Structures are given as structure tokens and as C-alpha cells.
Design a protein around this ligand. Sequence first.
Ligand SMILES: *[C@@H]1O[C@H](CO)[C@@H](O[C@@H]2O[C@H](CO)[C@@H](O)[C@H](O)[C@H]2NC(C)=O)[C@H](O)[C@H]1NC(C)=O
Ligand SMILES: *[C@@H]1O[C@H](CO)[C@@H](O)[C@H](O)[C@H]1NC(C)=O
Ligand SMILES: *[C@@H]1O[C@H](CO)[C@@H](O)[C@H](O)[C@H]1NC(C)=O
Ligand SMILES: [K+]
Length: 326
Amino acid sequence: HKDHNFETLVTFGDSYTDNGRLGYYINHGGKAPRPGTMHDETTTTASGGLSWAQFAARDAGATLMDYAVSGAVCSNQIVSRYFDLINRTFPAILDDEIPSFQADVLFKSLYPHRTAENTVYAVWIGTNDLGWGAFLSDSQTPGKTISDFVSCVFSVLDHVYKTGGRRFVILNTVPLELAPLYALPENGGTLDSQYWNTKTKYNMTEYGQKIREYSTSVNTMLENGALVMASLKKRWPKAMVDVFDVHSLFNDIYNAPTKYLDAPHNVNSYYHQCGPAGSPCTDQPGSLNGYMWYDELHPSNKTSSIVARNFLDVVAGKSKYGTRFH
Ligand SMILES: *[C@@H]1O[C@H](CO)[C@@H](O[C@@H]2O[C@H](CO)[C@@H](O)[C@H](O)[C@H]2NC(C)=O)[C@H](O)[C@H]1NC(C)=O
Ligand SMILES: *[C@@H]1O[C@H](CO)[C@@H](O)[C@H](O)[C@H]1NC(C)=O
Ligand SMILES: *[C@@H]1O[C@H](CO)[C@@H](O)[C@H](O)[C@H]1NC(C)=O
Ligand SMILES: [K+]
């Protein structure tokens, strides 16, 4: 615990990170928690267990403030999706998560001693922005591009910086073409999915290559844009900005699953298999620790634990997956 040089982990993102906040919106009339209150934490997330942020905070002996909301995009002004269950859009980072955090930091009951040195701020967003019903189906605000998505991520860091945060980690986009949702059926991919219930009406090869181009392009722009902003444009004076190349880590797990997963070392299918309505559902035999993917879109709790251990290495300034900018 004392081997990790922070006391508080603040996370922004989507269902890869969420530890109960969409559940709050669902159960409280589609409204965020009141300022100075957090949602109830769950230990059963979209991973089938803990999210990476929970593994990381537990191993660091850190308090987790997890503002991630399942379904989120970076900015609803760029692209949004309607969640009928809450009678509004899925919450987004700029529109919903950041305003919550900005209100909460004024409460000592939540943030007893938040300093530039003792708090790490992480953002992991893009899975929904780049995917079906968003940029992949050209559903964004007309004229917006994936370059505007990258600009939004840096705007998240501006808002954190403005509150006095200085230690930033951007987690880049995963290889979404390897998620069974976007993979070809011949390689374990879904047919019609709860996340894309018309997938089989499309050239699945073309859409999977398009999401590879979008994700790799965003990853190039996140790393070199962060370098420009941090090192040339003076955008975050005296901040430390890490980029965690979780894209390479996902490829490493996918390509060598016997090094990372328990039997059956499955990377191309998914543990929890639902019909295209999202119901009914069957779990595969054997351990969840033997699956890269809890479902066709979400990394397993086992994959999430691997993300967490590498994240802590990135925060320590000693990781093959970390690039640090002062
Ligand atoms: C991921 O979550 C699964 C499911 O909860 C965990 O696996 C089980 O762990 C318990 C405690 O060891 C066992 O008794 C069960 O037999 C397992 N399966 C079920 C259905 O409960 C797994 O340990 C978690 N992995 C990580 C890395 O946290
Ligand atoms: C959405 O609106 C319906 C009907 O107006 C209502 O019954 C329901 O409680 C709303 N959902 C949320 C989470 O507010
Ligand atoms: C589907 O997309 C792939 C990848 O671009 C292409 O090679 C193939 O010709 C396409 N098939 C059809 C029927 O359009
Ligand atoms: K610590």
C-alpha cells in the first residue's frame, strides 16, 4: 500500500470503470447523487466482478472516487445515446461526471485532504464514442470527427486541472476489433448482439476494420496530442500526464492468453452470453478467470485485474505501457 504514492484515485469513464454510478441514476429518477454524496459502490460491475479502478485503489490502499457511468461518452454535444430506462441520454464525462466531481471536491466529508501530490485522476473513455450508435454509425453531431473526441479528452483534464489536480493518466482505447461485439463470427464474434442487434445486416469485416482505424488513430492522437499540450503549449503547468497504452496490453493478453488467464485461456468468445434483447443469458462452464471478455464488449474481472496492476506501474513511472510527460 505505501509502495503506491497516492491516497485517492478519481476515475472518469464508462462501464469499463463504473462501480455503481449508472445504478444510482436508474434508482433515483435518472438524477446524479446530491453534491457531497457518492453512489453506493458494488463489487459486481460490467466485468462480472471488480472494475480495474477497484483493483487499483484496493492494491494502492487508496480511496476510490469513481465518477464513471456505464454507457458514457466523453461529450453529449459531440455524440449522445438515449437510455429509455432513465428518460434521458446516457450521462457523459463533460456533461455529468465532471460537474458532479466539481461540486463534490468542496465537501471535506468526501475529500478530507485532496492535494496535487496525493490524488491521481484517470480517464478511460472511447469504447462507446467510437462504436455502434456513435461514430461507427456516423450518429455524431453532423461535421464532428474523431479528432473532436480527442480534443474532448484533453478538455476533461482542463476541468480537473482547474480544481487543482495535477497527476493525470489517460487510458487509451482498446483494440475494439478484438471485442467479440466487433469481431467476425468465424473468429468467435457475435451475430446480432444486445449492443448491436442489427450487426448481421452489415459488412461486419468493413465495420471491424473501420473501428480498428478509429481506435488506432485516436490512440496516436492521444499520445502525441498529450505531448504537445504538456510539453509545448503549457496547457497544464506543473502537471504530470501519463498515457497508459492499454491497447498494447490488450493485444499482449489476446496474443498470449496462457501468460495472463486461467484455463480455458479464451480470448475470442465471452463468458456471459445473452440474446440480442439482452435476455435470456447463459454463463460458460469453468472460471471467469479463464475468459478475456465477461461479455462481447466488456473485459472480464481477470482482464481488469491485469489492467489495474499495469496502471499502478504507469503511476509509479515504471511501465512498458506508460509514456510520462511533464
Ligand atoms: C472474478 O469473478 C469471479 C466470479 O465471482 C471470481 O470467481 C469465483 O471466485 C470465488 C472465490 O474464489 C469461487 O468460489 C467461485 O467458484 C468462482 N466463481 C463463481 C461463480 O463464484 C474470480 O475469482 C474473480 N477474479 C478476480 C481476478 O477477481
Ligand atoms: C421514466 O419515465 C417513466 C414514465 O414517465 C417513469 O415511470 C420512470 O420512473 C422514469 N424512469 C426514471 C429512472 O426516472
Ligand atoms: C466487406 O468489407 C471488406 C473490408 O472492406 C471487403 O473486403 C469486402 O469486399 C466487403 N464485402 C462487400 C460485399 O461489400
Ligand atoms: K498509498
